[PDB]
């Protein structure tokens with residue numbers, strides 16, 4: 033019968049820091065991690081900026097000889113996974129290695145690597161393709177390499193649900209523990225889609241902010257002057273753990289994961305419904321899953337991508353789910369500061385949601401200078417808001433109409 | 445407790461046929477789907493053959509315009525999925541659409557699209573990248589497009605666990621129904637990696653059979669002259685359904701899904717341990733899940749890729765799990781005929797496991813002319829074997845040491 037699940041460890045690479053504490057300080061101070069991109073020439077692109085991971089040293093984690101074989105998304109995933117495990121204090125042994133699994137996902141995976149090998153193929157021939165092209169690019173290799181390095185023999189898999197990946201990864205890993213398939217799961221996601229095909233591809237679809245001359249003000253969720261999402265890189269990993277297993281070993285518990293919802297919009301390949309019907313279904317699923325009155329919700333970490341249709345759909349979903357309580361809770365998009373980490377988005381945002389519970393503060397939506405028509409909720413414009421948070425909700429919505437909601441609460 | 449899960453619809457594209465009955469007819473006849481790859485310059489490549497889908501007409505399923513938006517792997521997953529839903533007789537209504545979800549996966553995803561858009565990028569610049577590049581290439585768009593075309597609002601996700609994808613997709617879909625999160629799921633996998641990058645990428649790891657003189661003899665699982673796997677394309681989809689839901693509408697039930705096992709080798713990035721310790725834990729996990737003794741297993745559809753180390757590890761794993769019953773069961777590799785459909789391998793081989801139960805026949809391992817050292821099990825060499833089959837296992841063991849096992853049982 034269904035077991036309870038707590039968070040005992042967290043790790044992160046974001047545009048704001050090379051770990052959780054440093055990233056979280058940036059969040060609470062309203063700092064942007066968005067800057068013109070330096071790792072390639074974007075003069076022929078309509079978008080020339082994003083949230084890069086700055087000064088990442090893979091040799092804090094791996095040998096240069098292994099690192100070279102792996103796409104950045106995998107390096108980022110392992111760094112965050114390693115951080116989360118260290119932060120948990122958990123020791124892998126013969127007694128428990130079979131009860132510890134990993135579900136680290138990505139939206140796009142090794143696009144940089146696949147592009148580079150495509151270039152080698154087209155310009156030089158097939159004999160210049162890396163022998164590591166497949167194990168070093170495909171999405172399940174975060175879960176793979178983590179299990180090899182730590183000796184994790186539990187359930188080993190990866191989700192790819194586009195911008196919903198990190199939320200789904202975390203939610204399903206909690207279901208694994210809930211149902212007895214595992215006692216511990218390392219779950220989240222990683223993304224590094226800032227190559228030509230990534231920036232070009234979102235560019236072709238006219239989905240990205242083109243504010244090349246003011247990159248820190250580009251991501252402006254619910255602002256009337258928003259013009260698309262900002263593309264960001266990084267990783268989030270959490271250690272999820274059966275409550276009694278955590279209690280038995282005296283683990284520090286950050287929070288309890290009480291709720292998980294999924295739904296499909298069945299509306300459009302890329303556009304959300306204007307009324308947020310799919311998001312409303314998903315949140316209601318998650319709150320029912322948690323046994324909650326919707327009035328218990330204090331804080332929502334919105335998807336909040338800074339697209340015209342996405343942002344407004346979310347307001348509608350929250351108003352429809354929470355009614356008059358929609359006016360009492362605080363909702364913010366940390367994408368105002370981090371940008372959109374795509375498949376890692378749900379992962380870093382689940383960490384920020386937990387930290388909102390630990391520190392009792394709503395992170396700000398920076399750049400919200402003129403809230404758009406109907407965007408009249410407490411969106412924590414400009415500045416972090418200290419406040420009572422017992423229950424925090426993290427939303428994600430992706431291409432394919434795929435929706436995810438996580439529900440966290442304080443644990444005593 | 446836990447709801448029972450049955451199979452009420454199946455769909456398929458394979459190198460043997462454009463649907464299930466044509467593919468199954470090839471399987472039982474021991475026909476090969478392997479041939480030199482056409483309309484593609486493989487001159488500089490060490491492998492020139494594989495299992496292509498022959499004569500696929502996407503306009504039976506989609507308009508020309510919607511198909512132009514989608515990678516072949518997505519077209520193949522939609523084909524299989526529409527066939528499976530149609531095969532099931534299911535009527536989607538307002539009253540049930542929130543209880544019907546999708547989990548269709550891929551191991552490698554949109555390489556053909558990535559290649560063609562790379563061509564554009566390098567030759568002409570980013571502004572020639574297709575607007576539909578991203579949503580038309582990402583792995584969750586089979587689940588996404590299927591849910592939109594049919595109005596499915598239940599759990600909407602996609603696994604990517606390399607060569608284990610289709611096994612995990614079906615297993616986790618069965619969990620969703622068992623634990624009351626859905627009444628119906630469409631689950632499986634699709635793959636189209638018979639492009640330059642797939643053939644070049646795997647060719648660079650020297651993972652592929654190079655037997656160009658005799659493509660139909662290349663895939664020879666457990667044969668002492670095997671020299672690696674054969675790369676193949678296609679899709680499988682099953683309609684999974686809660687038993688009482690299936691009985692109430694009078695569904696035709698092919699078989700019951702009674703068990704799902706997962707495990708990680710925690711061994712190596714591409715190589716299994718020699719003793720198959722991980723495949724052994726996974727099969728034991730699947731049998732415990734089913735509440736079955738190893739002695740009750742009649743038929744195993746092996747992973748059986750035709751890699752030197754893979755085939756021998758699976759022999760060790762079965763001998764370890766099944767002790768004195770290991771010779772009594774029949775075990776065959778349908779990859780001897782289909783090749784390795786990678787992420788779709790577990791989907792089509794689940795379908796072949798279900799039809800082995802319906803038709804009481806173990807499919808052959810063709811090309812098994814000279815079993816290797818220790819390959820002395822009943823591997824159904826050369827020809828189909830009619831026999832009693834109450835319980836059938838389908839195994840998938842993929843890169844990152846990720847293992848999957850499904851247990852099916854006759855329903856009457």
Ligand SMILES: C[C@H](O)CNCc1ccc2c(c1)OCO2
Nearest residue numbers: 148149151152153154155156160
């Ligand atoms: C780090 C580097 O970008 C990887 N190789 C790409 C690359 C390969 C071959 C080429 C080329 C470019 O221009 C002409 O022939």
